[model samples]
Target chain A: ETEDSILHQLFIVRFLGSMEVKSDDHPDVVYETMRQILAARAIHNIFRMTESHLLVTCDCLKLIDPQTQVTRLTFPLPCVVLYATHQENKRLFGFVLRTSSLSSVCYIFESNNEGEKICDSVGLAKQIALHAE
Target chain B: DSILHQLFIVRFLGSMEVKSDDHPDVVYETMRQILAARAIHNIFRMTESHLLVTCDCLKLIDPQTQVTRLTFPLPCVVLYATHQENKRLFGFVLRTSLSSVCYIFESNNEGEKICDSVGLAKQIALHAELD
Candidate 1:
């Protein structure tokens, strides 16, 4: 059975910039996912941003294929953690997910001002969850 | 149906979870919620040493509970979390909201070894250095 969080995702962060999904062991699948966020948490109620393209249901997050609008990749929420920062002199937004005990994956995007907002807000929301409201 | 009723076939079995050591190098945020991922959704309570998933009714542990288990001393920045239909669970030990850093989609979305974690951790250190 599935249970929704205590509330809806507090909010989502969107980055309409260049993006790409790259894997370590699995090198065949890599596509640009320009935008994405459904974030929440469990136990005491919290989660983070998800891409607009990804689908959230049954407590798991699935990447949707734009071509057919089907699940491309599936993973549990526990395996995801996000980050936003500067690299090669440009602002970037991204996240790293553990696909299994042995495999991990990443997705990077070129985000400027918008990326900062995501970083600050992630901290702010933690300081104060906008959901339970 | 007879197949099951027939008998057991001998097979060479692996003794244990031999490759369990292979895992992401990052630390984990421990919280009461993550436990939900392994069982049914319900309320949980913190104890002096462990956690308890309480339904409104029966089922409950001790003595053996008194045995003991070590915890993940190190923790990770938990940017956000979600529920898993496959199971239920959370933890500082995952409530990373309070941690110095909550890892998430700050910007660079994807890469690896030669270009990811090693790169990411270096930058993260500088940020935490001052904050």
Candidate 2:
């Protein structure tokens, strides 16, 4: 909250999980029993953010390990899509990152604010992504 | 009209079988290949509610309106049908996960006249494969 300048602002998001929807090029199906499959499927992936990720304009974009401050993965944010599933009191935030044209991964997170911390702000990042072209 | 669900309309054209199935690795692995392969994701915009499909999940449009309610996250092995006689009859069956119910999709007060009973399966196939 202290940093009002969007560029200097650093947002910390806790890593929850990721769901990998394969590139099948076909319409898939799910039965009655598989409603919560994504949340439960691969909740513990090494490629997933270890503990948290540091999102700052100064820091391209990073997956970091908090206690040791080791960066797991880093990349400049790309043009992305965001999604959220909100219930009575809790919400899950997801961002789709396209690793390549052939595949993409959905990274899930639980944010610190109600949602707007990154909601309105990320459009700036999106604008940044768009402006490059 | 409103008690059961719009799903009450998908009438079964007839009965088909998958043969004496499932016991050990033979059946499970065989079906897993299909599961690892297909998905049913289409969203037909309905009046108040919407029709959506996802691979491997129970798609209950609701207590107010029933949908293609599956049990496991089982996908259609393959969508095969177009009852030879009943021009308007066709269906997609499951390979695993017990689900045996059917009804007509009944009406379209939304005002779009579609009478392709002769070519609807191709339409369904096109859309199902229209990933």
Candidate 3:
């Protein structure tokens, strides 16, 4: 039964500085676009970073058309890409699924050492990518 | 050189408490010996009876040749080798933590799949940059 049931594996990536969206859009638009992408990919877990805390999957990453508190978003794996980008004092890390239509998505982090952090994040991404493919 | 090729560098993610009824130190020592015997390299940190470890790779080796056949990225799987109490354990984790897909094998036949998974993960990880 344990083998048959879905198992969730979680990892956290911290930010080093303020985030910037390069695709040219309003923050709400960007957030909505990300939400749509997650829906398309059927990702069950997501966490958004902020100044004080990491927003969790149960609290934020789910969809509920709730007057009744029924949860609506959950999907099985087959994730395809995991990556991060570091530029200036910013670092971004996240995953993309094979079934996802969007090219890629990442959450940006601000850190004192972007270059070093980028290297570490990218290394981990490659490892994750290797497994996903 | 690409960042992954820099085998000397290691990054620390946060620690996790592995739940076991045994004293944390005893569990730590057991984990340490289990890893060491497999030639797995990691950084162990202990505090006030709590134990944590940081490792970047999971090195799987061949018993007969004593050669490393594959090196998986860390934060992977750890499985008990058998259902018996106090049995030796082994498991593999996929590269990305998110995927539910995994391979389960008898302990005797673990090598080929491990090698395959490592190679495929490596290929997928590197192949994307070329595009």
Candidate 4:
């Protein structure tokens, strides 16, 4: 026997491995801290991609909740920054995502590569870059 | 700019296949162990054939650092499906996984029928019988 139910479709991006976050007050906190920030911003639809990996829909980042069929978190066009910092034997990909209402947050992900792959996959780098005056 | 890391193709009731240049068998075996253990969470059924298996807190090793990392479970879904022949098997599993969801799609077949239909589960149980 079978029953009818709505099939929710969501486009998601995933990343794995070790990651860290940096802010003016908080330096080198676990990636779980970033997740908590997003959750505080009402972005609750995050998923586990693997043991240490996570996946979240771009829509959820913008505050769209498909499960509730509502858009909870709406924001004006936000300024985002994507750049790289290098350490001996390690490369750090940094993202500074900011909105007028929300506090500016900086994320530093540890990877060997230059960090273009993950930034590009989530279309975060393609969004408007904050021009420095 | 981007290199294909890995892709996993799992057919719950049909055949499960993994295609990768790096340790495809390891990946397959991992999935097998995971599914058999029922180590899944945040289950969602997108369709009759498409069921999502979301797992968090999976023990993973960092290939680069050669270190183990423990993750906080979150809300991601890995999709799977069922076939007519193995309907009971998948149905029981789905029910066990998410009882509320299963209530709406309850199976007509019994537990023994399900255990009998899936050879892997049957063998595992039979082996336990010997022990």
**Residue runs of model 2 more than 4 Å from their true location after superposition:** A1-8, A22-53, A79-91, B1-131
lDDT of 2 by residue, B1-131 (tens): 31211122232112223232333233333333322322222224222222223332212232232332222122333332333333343333333233222211223331121123213433444565676
Chain A TM-score for candidate 3 is 0.27
DockQ of predicted model 4: 0.02
Model 4 segments more than 4 A misplaced: A1-78, A87-90, A112-133, B1-39, B42-131
What residue runs in model 1 are displaced by over 4 Å at the alpha carbon?
Answer: A1-3, A6-62, A65-71, A87-91, A111-113, A117-133, B1-131
Which 10 consecutive residues of model 3 chain B have the lowest summed lDDT? B46-55
Candidate 4 structure quality by residue, lDDT tens digits, B112-131: 33323333333444565578
- lDDT (CA) per prediction: 0.29, 0.36, 0.31, 0.29
Interface C-alpha RMSD after superposing true interface residues, each candidate, one decimal: 17.0, 19.5, 17.1, 15.3
Which digits, one per residue and each the tens of the lDDT, describe model 1 over residues B51-90? Answer: 2111110011122322111111112222223223211221
Q: A1-133 in candidate 1: lDDT tens per residue?
A: 0254332222232322222234343322222221221110123232323343333332334444333343323434444444444433234555544432123345544343355554454334333333324
Give the clash count for model 4.
3
Strongest candidate by lDDT: 2
Worst 10 residues of 4 chain B by lDDT: B94-103
Native-vs-model 1 lDDT?
Answer: 0.29
Alpha carbon deviation, residue B94, candidate 2 (Å): 39
lDDT of residue B103 for candidate 3? 21
On residues B18-87, what C-alpha lDDT tens digit does candidate 3 reach at each position?
Answer: 3223232433343444444334334253111101111334443333333332333433433212223322
Recovered native contacts in candidate 2, as a fraction? 0.00
**Separate DockQ for every predicted complex:** 0.02, 0.01, 0.02, 0.02
